[PDB]
Write a protein that binds this ligand. Structure first.
Ligand SMILES: NC(=O)C1=CN([C@@H]2O[C@H](COP(=O)(O)OP(=O)(O)OC[C@H]3O[C@@H](n4cnc5c(N)ncnc54)[C@H](OP(=O)(O)O)[C@@H]3O)[C@@H](O)[C@H]2O)C=CC1
Length: 345
């Protein structure tokens, strides 16, 4: 009856993922719930860049454990309760977890699940894995805490990985919080058009064209005061070179390095480091799990905006548990616009 996806092989610390890294298998769910458990039917599962690290024997992060071979993978999920021997939850209840196993159905611990209210997302439950969830909180809290945005101050925000989930939301949050100019950098023209025609970014820079330096100059004459960074690498050495004094880098992620033998908090190149030092550019580690008491208000704020249509939510949806592998790989190589999600039932 139940299908589950396990990690079949690892790509090596310096390898690129293949769909085949994951494998589907069938298993029998125990038909009896012991005290405290709930049986849930999986509705949606998330795939996210941090999972590339969990495919390594060593994740390089002390707060992410590696996945083991032949064992079921896991991550952000949203499902519906079917049977429940736990008081706070009953049939039809919608619950979520960041440790949801990649299974059609599961028997989880009631204390490990949080019930979500369909109203906050206009019924689109998959949003709780994105804009109205971890990714949106990362963009909102990242900006509110490391952004030093001052309404009317007339700052310019550069957002990398701008057509991804965190990027598309931050650029928009950027505007709503006071920045007057927001420019996104992404890997392709159609993504660029999405940023300016649907999200409202003032400009887009296609880095596949090959002259990020120059495009940036032109799109940013006046320097960069805020850089929501999702990619790191050359792209970042370029936004930084053009940042102004006392500006800030929200160090959200560095996806360009994930498949290279590289310590997540990599250090800027000597010359680039020199410039950061001179203009006094704040570049501090940012991990959203460190701001837990800011989640409910962040949730209420993001929901509010979404509900007023002030915050546009875009997603790319794949279908079926047997396609976790390919949806994960596809996202890591840019096949998604917005949050990558996989529909499970
Ligand atoms: N600090 C925190 O708490 C959190 C951090 N993050 C980080 O935020 C970043 C974005 O996450 P998320 O919104 O889930 O994912 P995205 O929705 O942004 O999906 C990944 C995107 O990265 C881009 N990309 C892939 N390889 C490269 C490359 N070599 N150079 C430049 N861009 C590349 C692609 O877009 P394109 O077509 O433009 O290349 C791809 O679509 C990640 O680095 C992630 O680790 C996420 C959650 C929390």
């Amino acid at each position: 009856i139940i299908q589950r996806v396990v990690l079949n092989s690892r790509p090596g610390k310096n390898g690129n993922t293949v769909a085949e890294n994951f494998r589907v298998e069938e298993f029998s769910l125990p038909d009896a719930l012991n005290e405290g458990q709930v049986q849930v039917r999986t509705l949606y599962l998330s795939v996210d860049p941090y999972m590339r690290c969990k495919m390594n024997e060593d994740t390089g992060t002390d707060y992410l454990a590696p996945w083991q071979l032949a064992q079921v993978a896991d991550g952000g999920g949203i499902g519906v309760v079917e049977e429940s021997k736990h008081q706070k939850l009953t049939k039809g209840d919608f619950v979520t977890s960041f440790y949801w196993p990649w299974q059609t159905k599961a028997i989880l611990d009631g204390n490990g699940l949080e019930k979500v209210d369909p109203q906050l997302v206009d019924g689109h439950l998959s949003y709780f894995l994105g804009a109205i969830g971890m990714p949106g909180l990362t963009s909102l809290i990242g900006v509110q805490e490391k952004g030093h945005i001052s309404a009317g101050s007339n700052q310019t925000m550069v957002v990398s990985g701008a057509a991804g989930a965190c990027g598309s939301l931050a650029g928009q949050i950027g505007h709503l919080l006071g920045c007057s100019r927001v420019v996104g950098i992404c890997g392709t023209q159609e993504k660029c058009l999405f940023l300016t025609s649907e999200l409202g970014f003032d400009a887009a820079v296609n880095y596949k064209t090959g002259n990020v330096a120059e495009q940036l100059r032109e799109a940013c004459p006046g320097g960069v005061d805020v850089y929501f960074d999702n990619v790191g690498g050359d792209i970042s050495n370029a936004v930084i070179s053009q940042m102004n004094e006392n500006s800030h880098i929200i160090l959200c992620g560095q996806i360009s390095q994930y498949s290279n033998d590289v310590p997540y908090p990599p250090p800027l190149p000597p010359a680039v480091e020199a410039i950061r030092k001179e203009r006094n550019i704040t570049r501090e580690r940012f991990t959203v799990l460190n701001y837990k008491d800011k989640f409910e208000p962040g949730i209420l704020q993001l929901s509010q905006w979404f509900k007023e249509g002030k915050l546009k939510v875009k997603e790319t949806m794949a279908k079926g548990l047997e396609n976790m592998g390919v949806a994960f790989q596809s996202m890591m190589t840019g096949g998604n616009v917005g949050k990558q999600i996989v529909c499970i039932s």
